[PDB]
Structures are given as C-alpha cells and as structure tokens.
Design a protein around this motif. Structure first.
Motif: not given
Ligand SMILES: [Zn+2]
Lengths: 30, 78
Positions: A9, A19-20, A23-24, A26-28, A30, B10, B70
């Motif tokens: 993105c 870590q943040i 995680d960001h 990773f969230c793609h 999902l 996000l 998140h």
C-alpha cells in the motif's frame, strides 16, 4: 533505513516500530 | 491497574483505549464499539502476527502497557 515502506500500500513506517509494521503487512493477508 | 493500548487501522486512524490486563478480547471489541460504533462481530483484532480469540485476555496474549494492536474490519460471517 530510517523508514520502511509497506510493499502493498506504500504506507511509511518508522523502522523503530518493527512489530507494528510487520503486523500491518500481515493484515493485508486478511 | 488500568493501562492504555492503541488499536491501529490498516490505512486509517489509530484508536486509544483504556484497559486492564484482565480484559478479554471481547471486552476490547466492546470498547471499540463504544468509541467508534463498530459491532464486535465486524472486528478482527491482530497482535504479533495472529488474530486474537474473544474469550482470552490481554495478559494471556502478553499484551502490555502501550501496546499497539491492529483492527481489520469485516462483515459478520456466522
Ligand atoms: Zn500496507
């Protein structure tokens, strides 16, 4: 590097908060 | 006892919450619903590379003071 760029993105994250960022990215998935 | 955590989206803003380590993931989603109007069944909460299960607590997941989680949004799936 000072900053990371999300490879999906193009959001920019400071390299110090790893870590943040991870995680960001990773969230793609999902 | 209590402590603040952050819930990042996000691609939008970040949410700040006041919690205790004894709080369940279901409680945290209730608190987001209070601050943002999102029902809990539309919320996935993520920390350290996994989604968090509702009935487990923050201390369970080693979520501590000032941690950043998140929020990935969803429709209610069954
Ligand atoms: Zn991204």
């Amino acid at each position: 590097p000072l900053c990371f760029n999300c490879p999906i993105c193009d959001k920019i994250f400071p390299a110090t908060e790893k870590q943040i960022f991870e995680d960001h990215v990773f969230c793609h998935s999902l | 006892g209590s402590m603040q955590i952050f819930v990042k989206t996000l691609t939008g803003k970040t949410i700040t919450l006041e919690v205790e380590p004894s709080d369940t993931i279901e409680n945290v989603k209730a608190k987001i619903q209070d601050k943002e109007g999102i029902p809990p069944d539309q919320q996935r909460l993520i920390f350290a590379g996994k989604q968090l299960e509702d009935g487990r607590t923050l201390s369970d997941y080693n979520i501590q003071k000032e941690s950043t989680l998140h929020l990935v949004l969803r429709l209610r799936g069954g």
